[PDB]
Design an enzyme around this catalytic site. Structure first.
Site, mmCIF file in Angstrom:
data_model
loop_
_atom_site.group_PDB
_atom_site.id
_atom_site.type_symbol
_atom_site.label_atom_id
_atom_site.label_comp_id
_atom_site.label_asym_id
_atom_site.label_seq_id
_atom_site.Cartn_x
_atom_site.Cartn_y
_atom_site.Cartn_z
ATOM 1 N N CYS A 32 -37.000 4.655 23.057
ATOM 2 C CA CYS A 32 -35.395 5.442 23.058
ATOM 3 C C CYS A 32 -35.543 6.330 24.277
ATOM 4 C CB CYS A 32 -35.609 6.351 22.141
ATOM 5 S SG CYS A 32 -35.196 8.155 21.928
ATOM 6 N N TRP A 72 -37.223 2.876 12.312
ATOM 7 C CA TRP A 72 -38.214 2.915 12.812
ATOM 8 C C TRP A 72 -39.337 2.961 11.587
ATOM 9 C CZ3 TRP A 72 -37.685 2.400 17.810
ATOM 10 C CH2 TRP A 72 -35.944 2.894 18.783
ATOM 11 N N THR A 111 -33.620 9.979 13.086
ATOM 12 C CA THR A 111 -33.925 9.355 14.800
ATOM 13 C C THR A 111 -34.912 10.052 15.714
ATOM 14 O OG1 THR A 111 -32.819 11.443 15.132
ATOM 15 C CG2 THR A 111 -31.662 9.502 14.865
ATOM 16 N N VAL A 112 -35.711 9.430 16.404
ATOM 17 C CA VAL A 112 -36.230 10.251 17.258
ATOM 18 C C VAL A 112 -35.296 10.913 18.596
ATOM 19 C CG1 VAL A 112 -38.473 8.693 16.601
ATOM 20 C CG2 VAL A 112 -36.811 7.544 18.083
ATOM 21 N N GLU A 127 -33.590 17.447 18.368
ATOM 22 C CA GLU A 127 -32.786 17.368 19.504
ATOM 23 C C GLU A 127 -33.500 17.306 20.381
ATOM 24 O OE1 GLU A 127 -29.503 16.490 19.137
ATOM 25 O OE2 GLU A 127 -28.744 16.595 20.501
ATOM 26 N N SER A 128 -33.470 16.421 21.453
ATOM 27 C CA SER A 128 -34.036 16.139 22.396
ATOM 28 C C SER A 128 -33.780 17.475 23.792
ATOM 29 C CB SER A 128 -34.022 15.014 23.223
ATOM 30 O OG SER A 128 -32.782 14.387 23.915
ATOM 31 N N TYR A 175 -23.585 4.098 25.853
ATOM 32 C CA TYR A 175 -23.830 3.194 24.730
ATOM 33 C C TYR A 175 -22.483 3.196 23.742
ATOM 34 C CZ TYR A 175 -28.616 3.955 23.872
ATOM 35 O OH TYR A 175 -30.048 4.436 24.335
HETATM 36 N N1 LIG Z 1 -28.774 13.327 19.349
HETATM 37 C C1 LIG Z 1 -30.785 13.051 19.313
HETATM 38 C C2 LIG Z 1 -30.182 12.184 19.402
HETATM 39 C C3 LIG Z 1 -31.540 10.319 19.062
HETATM 40 C C4 LIG Z 1 -31.444 9.294 19.038
HETATM 41 O O1 LIG Z 1 -29.636 9.242 19.174
HETATM 42 N N2 LIG Z 1 -32.668 8.111 19.057
HETATM 43 C C5 LIG Z 1 -31.690 6.785 18.410
HETATM 44 C C6 LIG Z 1 -33.230 5.720 19.523
HETATM 45 S S1 LIG Z 1 -32.403 5.973 20.657
HETATM 46 C C7 LIG Z 1 -32.751 7.158 17.007
HETATM 47 O O2 LIG Z 1 -33.501 7.239 16.564
HETATM 48 N N3 LIG Z 1 -31.979 6.369 16.508
HETATM 49 C C8 LIG Z 1 -32.578 5.908 14.887
HETATM 50 C C9 LIG Z 1 -30.777 5.213 13.662
HETATM 51 O O3 LIG Z 1 -29.909 5.943 14.581
HETATM 52 O O4 LIG Z 1 -31.238 4.766 13.282
HETATM 53 C C10 LIG Z 1 -31.489 13.564 20.911
HETATM 54 O O5 LIG Z 1 -30.124 13.850 21.849
HETATM 55 O O6 LIG Z 1 -32.112 13.838 20.859
#
Ligand SMILES: N[C@@H](CCC(=O)N[C@@H](CS)C(=O)NCC(=O)O)C(=O)O
Ligand SMILES: N[C@@H](CCC(=O)N[C@@H](CS)C(=O)NCC(=O)O)C(=O)O
Lengths: 306, 306
Positions: A32, A72, A111-112, A127-128, A175
């Site tokens: 990610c 994940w 999410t990560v 939030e990254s 994306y």
């Molecule tokens: N808003 C979050 C975005 C995090 C994100 O889109 N992570 C993705 C990995 S690229 C994720 O863990 N997606 C898992 C899912 O939606 O099932 C950030 O900027 O930290």
């Protein structure tokens, strides 16, 4: 009981989350880009001892028996897959499980990244963009590189402005290209993407970094996308009007940042490729992983010319 | 009643198919590289008046109501789609229908190219490698460019040998990469593909054409694959260890052949892209067409240096 986790570490009185060493933990996936922002900051700011991290497996698996949710998962042991470690902290088997353990009322995606608190057994922030801000200022009392500031006051205006059109056009834009289900929306995203890239190319032709002569937050947000472009985005997301390799400035610019001490540590191309090509049978049914150009980003660059 | 159509035009006595003008007709798709071989020969040898041709629509459609077979279809009118014309010769609506009209016992695939005979109302041949051989020798009495020989005796040994490893590694190799359902077989095809390409690159570094200082059959077989590489094969078939653009010799070599009078006529990138990305919901569900580098193959090349 919280529906969202958007709190902040703070060196303030009466703060739920003071920047204590060994207190917080970062959950990520090398694949990610958003999570990779945080890994970069841990190495750049020298917060390795303060904040440990664990990476999940790159390819999604089933998180439960009762439903078919994919996402994940942690390995069961350290030897199950390179780059991935089990969650020894809370014994979780999936990122989903960590969220449920924090709050049964969470309404977001599983999410990560995830910034975990070992004391209150909860999620501080996921939030990254926010995690890297508090990684940049709040841990300076114990940071190995406290002086280094990636969001200095005299750049915040330019950084926030750069981050603006870089997020819509590049970071998130790739994306938009990949998730597009119709031709029109795809071309919109692809066109806008390469408008942003050309804009970067012109900037990096006059100066070393995207917001001037010194590294900034804007560079890290851009880099995590570029380092994935030719291997993933150029094929998986059909972003092929031009490859990064064909942008001489951005290409060497990526090498430059990659070669910054501790940055290469945060680039695991295997996890990157395995995730994107392996976790979406929708876009890539047979889960084939392209050979890829296998570029050596440790090779010489020309960015010192500035 | 024939199960196969592998006969030959011949300037011999007691021959079913003498090389008469206006007698034969070529059915193609601009998208197909194999069919594009034949179009190239029609222009190179100057057989336009002798043998007319018709192109089907690029994107496959249903050929019948009773079954769900997908394949080549003719437009109903001349204005339905650019580059495509209805079958005014036999009033067929699909390539499949042309085969059935030739023989109800045909056991092969309903493929292009198709060399049709207006006299016996049958298919002379549907093998591109064979069609171009008889286009090269049998119509020299009426060919506008009769002298030009792409398969001269003193090269046949080298041409057949080149064609050998170029067919397995490049012409057909790109498909091995795309149709691969497992990682191992994919990597086998991809590795062997770029071994062949590197081999071409080294050859074309010492000389102008693949089999010496003059154009030959081998060059046409190679060109039709290269001209489709970056737009289709590099993304659709995941052939991305290296793009043609990154091979300086082969890249200019493609421009050189493209700029040969009448060759550009046979390259319809729209049909090419629309077919591959639009006719396989298996590999490309939403049928999105990548933006593509949009290379101008009319631009200057350095191949005259020989
Ligand atoms: N808003 C979050 C975005 C995090 C994100 O889109 N992570 C993705 C990995 S690229 C994720 O863990 N997606 C898992 C899912 O939606 O099932 C950030 O900027 O930290
Ligand atoms: N052996 C033939 C191959 C022709 C061929 O594979 N044509 C493809 C187009 S790229 C086709 O018409 N396929 C239709 C189908 O299989 O349904 C030749 O070399 O001429």
């Amino acid at each position: 009981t919280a529906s969202t986790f958007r709190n902040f570490i703070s060196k303030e009185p009466n703060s739920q989350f003071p920047p204590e060493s060994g207190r917080y933990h970062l959950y990520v996936s090398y694949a990610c880009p958003w999570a990779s922002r945080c890994l970069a900051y841990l190495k750049i700011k020298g917060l390795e001892k303060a904040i440990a991290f664990t990476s999940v497996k790159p390819i999604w698996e089933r998180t439960k028996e009762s439903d078919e949710h994919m996402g994940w998962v942690f390995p069961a042991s350290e030897t199950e897959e390179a780059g991935a470690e089990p969650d020894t902290l809370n014994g979780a088997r999936s990122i989903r499980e960590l969220y449920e353990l924090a709050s049964t009322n969470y309404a977001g995606k599983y999410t990560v990244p995830v910034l975990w608190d070992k004391k209150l057994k909860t999620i501080v922030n996921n939030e990254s963009s926010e995690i890297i801000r508090m990684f940049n200022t709040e841990f300076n009392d114990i940071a190995e590189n406290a002086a280094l500031d990636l969001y200095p006051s005299h750049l915040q205006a330019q950084i926030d402005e750069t981050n603006g059109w870089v997020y819509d056009g590049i970071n998130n834009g790739v994306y938009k290209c990949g998730f597009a289900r119709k031709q029109g929306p795809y071309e919109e995203a692809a066109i806008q993407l390469y408008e942003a890239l050309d804009k970067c190319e012109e900037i990096l032709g006059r100066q070393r970094y995207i917001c001037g002569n010194t590294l900034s937050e804007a560079d890290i947000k851009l880099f995590v996308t570029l380092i994935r472009f030719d291997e993933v985005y150029a094929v998986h997301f059909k972003c092929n009007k031009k490859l990064l390799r064909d942008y001489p400035n951005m290409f060497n610019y990526t090498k430059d940042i990659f070669q910054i001490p501790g940055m290469s540590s945060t680039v695991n191309m295997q996890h990157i490729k395995r995730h994107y090509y392996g976790s979406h049978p929708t876009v890539n049914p047979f889960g084939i992983i392209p050979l890829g150009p296998d570029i050596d980003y440790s090779s010489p660059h020309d960015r010192n010319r500035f």
